């Protein structure tokens, strides 16, 4: 029951991570967001966060993977 309004919200959230707009979230971009929240993750911790949702194993998160993750939390 994923609506177009929800996909638009999730795409906006994705864009907040995807700092350079290239369609993928990297550990560098994730680290930038975490440090702006006062967090202090290691590269290994960032790679762990990506791995949990990196469906195709290429080491970065694209929007299909991000949407899949948000849809799973909905159910």
């Amino acid at each position: 029951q994923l609506t177009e309004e929800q996909i638009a919200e999730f795409k906006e959230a994705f864009s907040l991570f995807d700092k350079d707009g290239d369609g993928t979230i990297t550990t560098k971009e994730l680290g930038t967001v975490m440090r702006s929240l006062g967090q202090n993750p290691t590269e290994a911790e960032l790679q762990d966060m990506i791995n949990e949702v990196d469906a195709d194993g290429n080491g970065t998160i694209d929007f299909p993977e991000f949407l899949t993750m948000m849809a799973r939390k909905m159910k």
Binding site: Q6, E9, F10, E12, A13, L16, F17, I25, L30, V33, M34, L37, Q39, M49, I50, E52, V53, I61, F66, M69, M70, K73, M74
Partner: peptide, 20 residues
């Protein structure tokens, strides 16, 4: 210990509300 979903709820609460 925070997941990508956890960080999304921090930086995009509307996405958060939809999930909950």
């Amino acid at each position: 210990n925070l997941s990508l979903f956890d960080l999304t709820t921090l930086i995009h609460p509307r996405s958060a509300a939809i999930a909950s």
